[PDB]
């Protein structure tokens, strides 16, 4: 009972209907500035507002090119390209590309998933257009920013039991790539998520150019001049959950934290973090993932990370977020480097909180001398120097199992206690903590 349409104009009325089975015919469809206006294709934002329920939309072999100037055609208002408000919808196989790099007038998201039991599968999304682009979050990601931002993020998962499956999300925009706000039981599965990087040294080389960073003398939002020797993503989170947000289900506005997120078989490359779910409540579960060249690998706060890998070229593979982290169980492989090392954090892992069970595995034999597993201590992390983000650094670790099946050294700080360490080698383990146990393992 599939209805096939051959233009965006004939597609739009179906987005208001329940129980439809619609296919946009293979082809290339362009959305330009002249398509936005009262008498034009798109009079309102979101451009594609899926209000119906129990519908299926087939975008196989559809290329949708959206000119980034459309992000400025709705005044000082947020522009979403796609938003799902209905329930039990399936959208599949769309290839969506932002054309050009024009920044939104306010902010933008490519896709916002509200409602319940929706699935977006097989999408290929290229995100462009944001301001400032080139600094990551160094000069602001919220209010009071050093440089005023106009962010543009990829997929915002909200609602209930919403599902992003087998998608490719490429971001060249300052914003999250995939993030969750007020989402209950979201699932991200089989996705490839990719940003790009820039060194802080390259940013500092803007001295004397009159760039926005040069005009503030490179003073970051963290309270200090941008330090040399770090590799930053130009994006925010690869997959990042919020402890806040607004969603809509069945007409009901809901403000709540993300809860019960699941991330399965995802690859995240060159983002600010691979998988960060520490701010979500409920059960956090991450399995089968690969994090490459991110500033941080896995930070879920509490729950399970199993059969996951990350390299350590730009940041630690593992970070406890706060000293209140409790019950973080993790089995992480430190992968061979995906590119040259540029890790100014001087750690492959930062461990704290209590009652964790942590296994690290690696076949790396060539260990850079600045890389160690830290239990407590003063992490030289880009965003936590000099008292910045104080709850995220310099906290105690107690009652933690640490199985170090790697050649990386371990430093147990004086704030660590009751750490049960097993390790391939114990000669490179420094123990300044209280009542820690260190035992050797064979190979």
Author numbering: 1 to 443
Describing publication, verbatim:
FdlA from Flavobacterium sp. SA-0082 is an endo-type fucoidan-degrading enzyme that cleaves the sulfated fuco-glucuronomannan (SFGM) through a lytic mechanism.
We first measured the enzymatic activity of 12 mutants and found that eight of them (D137A, K141A, H176A, F179A, E236A, R240A, Y242A, and Y242F) almost completely abolished their activities, H279A mutant retained approximately 65% of the activity compared with WT, while mutations of Asn243, Arg272, and Tyr322 to Ala only negligibly affect their activities. In the WT structure, both Asp137 and Glu236 form hydrogen bonds with Arg272, while Arg272 participates in the shaping of the alkaline pocket. These results suggest that the steric hindrance of Arg272 in the two mutants may interfere with the substrate fully entering the pocket and hence the correct positioning of the glycosidic O atom, thus resulting in the complete loss of activities of D137A and E236A mutants. Circular dichroism (CD) spectra showed that all inactive mutants possess similar secondary structures to the wild-type protein, indicating that the loss of activity of these mutants is due to the residue mutations, but not protein conformational changes.
